[PDB]
Amino acid sequence: ITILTLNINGLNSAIKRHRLASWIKSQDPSVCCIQETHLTCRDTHRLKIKGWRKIYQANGKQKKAGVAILVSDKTDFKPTKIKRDKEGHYIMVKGSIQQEELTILNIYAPNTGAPRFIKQVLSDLQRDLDSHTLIMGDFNTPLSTLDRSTRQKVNKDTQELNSALHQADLIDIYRTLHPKSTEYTFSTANGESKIDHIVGSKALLSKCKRTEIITNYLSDHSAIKLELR
Ligand SMILES: [Mn+2]
Numbered sequence: 001i002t003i004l005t006l007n008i009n010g011l012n013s014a015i016k017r018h019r020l021a022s023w024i025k026s027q028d029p030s031v032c033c034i035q036e037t038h039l040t041c042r043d044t045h046r047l048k049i050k051g052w053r054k055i056y057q058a059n060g061k062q063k064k065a066g067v068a069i070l071v072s073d074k075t076d077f078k079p080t081k082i083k084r085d086k087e088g089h090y091i092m093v094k095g096s097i098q099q100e101e102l103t104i105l106n107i108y109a110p111n112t113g114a115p116r117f118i119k120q121v122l123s124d125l126q127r128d129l130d131s132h133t134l135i136m137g138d139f140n141t142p143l144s145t146l147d148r149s150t151r152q153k154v155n156k157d158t159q160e161l162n163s164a165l166h167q168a169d170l171i172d173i174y175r176t177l178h179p180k181s182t183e184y185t186f187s188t189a190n191g192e193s194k195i196d197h198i199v200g201s202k203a204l205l206s207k208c209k210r211t212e213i214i215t216n217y218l219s220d221h222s223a224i225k226l227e228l229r
Helices: 014-027 114-124 156-167 173-177 202-207
Strands: 002-007 031-035 054-058 067-071 077-084 090-097 100-108 133-138 170-172 196-201 208-214 223-228
Touching: 002 014, 002 100, 002 133, 002 196, 014 031, 031 100, 031 133, 054 077, 054 090, 067 090, 067 100, 100 114, 114 156, 133 223, 156 170, 170 173, 170 202, 173 196, 173 202, 173 208, 196 202, 196 223, 202 208
Parallel strands: 002 031, 100 133
Antiparallel strands: 002 223, 031 067, 054 067, 077 090, 090 100, 133 196, 170 196, 208 223
């Protein structure tokens, strides 16, 4: 299967929804984690993509944040649990694909206090984390020195997040498969950073076949795609 993460930078326009649908069809992911749909909980019906009927969403009441997990019609996904943030910053979906269990946590961290935010979500969802977990999305933080063009060491709050990840036997899959990578998923006029991530259970590393970053015209973030046995 293929799993794809993208911060879409809003889906309140028909044109954005159309171009996203075309891009998804082309990429043909089994499961797609989207951040920043900007859809209100009253507007979630607006997200429909032919070929991806099962769409699980977490949304607040304003046109900000918002996350979705889309599952391909060709994927026989059998859900077992879905947990939605009432504020629209994360959604967890658990289930199986051909008798292989998978836990996916789609996260959009705020641009201030991100590593603290992510650490708190991990704590809140501690009982549902497992040895077949993927945590993906826009963490709004580096995880290691090479995740920023500046090469600054990550701060204390980020170190604390990394320790919490380590205690859960979670690793940065991208950086594990590509240790020397100086790729990025976000930029500004003066620098670049890899703030979008695929984190997962140590036990899933054996199933992780390939991962890559995908630049695109849709958003101010590049996507990350993972192929999983
Ligand atoms: Mn944004």
